[PDB]
Design a protein around this ligand. Sequence first.
Ligand SMILES: O=C[C@H](O)[C@@H](O)[C@H](O)[C@H](O)COP(=O)(O)O
Ligand SMILES: [Mg+2]
Length: 467
Amino acid sequence: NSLKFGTSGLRGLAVELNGLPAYAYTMAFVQMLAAKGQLQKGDKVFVGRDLRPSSPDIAALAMGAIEDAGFTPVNCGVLPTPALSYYAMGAKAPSIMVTGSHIPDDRNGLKFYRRDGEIDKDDEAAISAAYRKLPALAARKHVGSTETDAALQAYADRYAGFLGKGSLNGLRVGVYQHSSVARDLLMYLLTTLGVEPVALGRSDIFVPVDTEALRPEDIALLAQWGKSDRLDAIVSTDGDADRPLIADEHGQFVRGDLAGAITATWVGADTLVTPVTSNTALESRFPKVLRTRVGSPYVIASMAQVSGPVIGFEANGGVLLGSTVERNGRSLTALPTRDALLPILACLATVHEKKTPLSTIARSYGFRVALSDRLQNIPQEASTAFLALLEDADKRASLFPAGDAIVRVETIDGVKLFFQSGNAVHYRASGNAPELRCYVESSDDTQAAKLQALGLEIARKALKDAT
Ligand SMILES: O=C[C@H](O)[C@@H](O)[C@H](O)[C@H](O)COP(=O)(O)O
Ligand SMILES: [Mg+2]
């Protein structure tokens, strides 16, 4: 009942997914591929997972369905979503990642990959249609495929071999581990690159990290760790490690779209593709920016139409490298799905090459002061109603303070309100969980904080009133 596609992935409550649904959705997927002639009897399907409590069970159900359908499940254990996809795509095989990514800890999901990339919105519909048509099925777990570290090792080597052993010697970097599937990978990879890494804040409890809505606790932790004069940066990822979480030499967060810009510069990108929620200062630096709806499938579909490299990224910080990049005789092949290691390493490499701290690098882009947050536990019907309210000219004027007039409204993806002052407030329903997003831009830190608070209070009040 909670289980549906949305922005990307099939997601919903862990207690619903952990059972027949995970098995049946996996069956729908593989049978969808086989029907289309793309999967033949005995072909490999790679499965990976994150560190959510339900993830081992859900992976085992997925692997059961793969095998019952007549295909070969390959257990890749615990690893980043981009590691699984990089490896499976290199093997020309589909894959399934078990993760809820950023979503709350009572939820989980499945992220589906074809042999050549993320599933698209047509695929999502064909899976849902196939799922609907399945019989009333004998769900079965597969614990029997021994874990292979091949995918994690290949992924590590992608970066080690591209930058080269010892190429970042001199850096000292904190690794905020929490429950990131890359918590250990980052330690050994950084060490191989000549960085001195320091483990910080490992958690035996799953921590849902949303890089577009950091917990005040994580912000305070990054500041506290990063206030040491001993660290050049703190690096991390979210749960399934498709998004970076990067802080500078003072422990201040570098917003994901700025890490994305730093990465675009580093790889010498010709065209950038990013959603509408990315910082509006991007176009000031980069002359070819294609703006999209929010979500990886939208970014990928625009990247695919583009003929240096094509780079995609979102304000969540995930980077989608669209073209092979060359450097000092070494290649980094295209990986058109969100990655955290690329932006992390691009940021560290920039610091290393320019002998300049990350805060100065970040400031050099002159980004508008942006903030983002979300309200949790907001049903789809309630966020749909609120967003409709904002389409009424009278209602908009009623909800916002009179002194700053709304001069433009866009409904490309949610509702974005542009003000005469230059302020902007953007609301979106999350497609991945019952949450309402509020993103703002303003002219300085004080005004931005006030604007973020106002935007969230306006939504809170209107949501309570409509109830
Ligand atoms: O979130 C995960 C999405 O699939 C990702 O591609 C998207 O850009 C944002 O991280 C937020 O999307 P929502 O705001 O819809 O949750
Ligand atoms: Mg994620």
